[PDB]
């Protein structure tokens, strides 16, 4: 059984993507649900689990079957507990792009998430670990990270810091190896 992964804080998307691309044997993505209709080249159970009834998915959301659920363009989307479990049971760490609220939900489902928060040391440090954004965007990312830590600190398996994304990525990989015992 492989513990699912939730990385949070600035650069988490880049970390998620890189783990998936670098170690395809170790990490995988689970299959999400949506109520939107299936399109060409899409396969039920691979791209999405396609739900025929919006009423069904709402009931399931209310029954706590989803660790993360939302809507876009008139349709429902979500990441089910069972989909994560299916990845974990195949021996792969499920890389989850989800909010910190999904951590307590995975714990309550006894899936043992490894929740890693990437903490910016300062506004200055955000522009060190993310080279794609402006100072005022970094300010907004910094305020978000501050609020996330204030709220979710108890949920974190570990907090990582660094002066570059490369260093942070290195620490992230090390945390996952250590917590995979």
């Amino acid at each position: 059984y492989a513990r699912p992964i939730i990385i949070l804080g600035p650069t988490k998307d880049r970390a998620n993507d890189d783990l998936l691309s670098e170690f395809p044997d170790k990490f995988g993505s689970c299959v999400p649900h949506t109520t939107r209709p299936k399109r060409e080249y899409e396969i039920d159970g691979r791209d999405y689990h396609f739900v025929s009834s919006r009423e069904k998915m709402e009931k399931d959301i209310q029954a706590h079957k989803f660790i993360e659920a939302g809507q876009y363009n008139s349709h429902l989307y979500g990441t089910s507990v069972q989909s994560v479990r299916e990845v974990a049971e195949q021996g792969k760490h499920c890389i989850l792009d989800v909010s910190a609220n999904a951590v307590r939900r995975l714990q309550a489902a006894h899936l043992h998430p490894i929740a890693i928060f990437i903490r910016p040391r300062s506004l200055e440090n955000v522009l060190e670990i993310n080279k794609r954004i402006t100072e005022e965007q970094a300010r907004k990312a910094f305020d978000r990270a501050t609020k996330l830590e204030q709220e979710f600190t108890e949920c974190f398996s570990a907090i990582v810091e660094g002066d570059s994304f490369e260093e942070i990525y290195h620490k992230v990989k090390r945390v996952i190896e250590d917590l995979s015992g």
Binding site: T34, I61, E68, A69, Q71, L76, Y77, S99, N101
Partner: peptide
């Protein structure tokens, strides 16, 4: 962040 996947966009309106 242009042409963000729809699943990732759905995170912006969460329940």
């Amino acid at each position: 962040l242009s042409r963000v996947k729809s699943l990732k966009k759905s995170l912006r309106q969460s329940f």
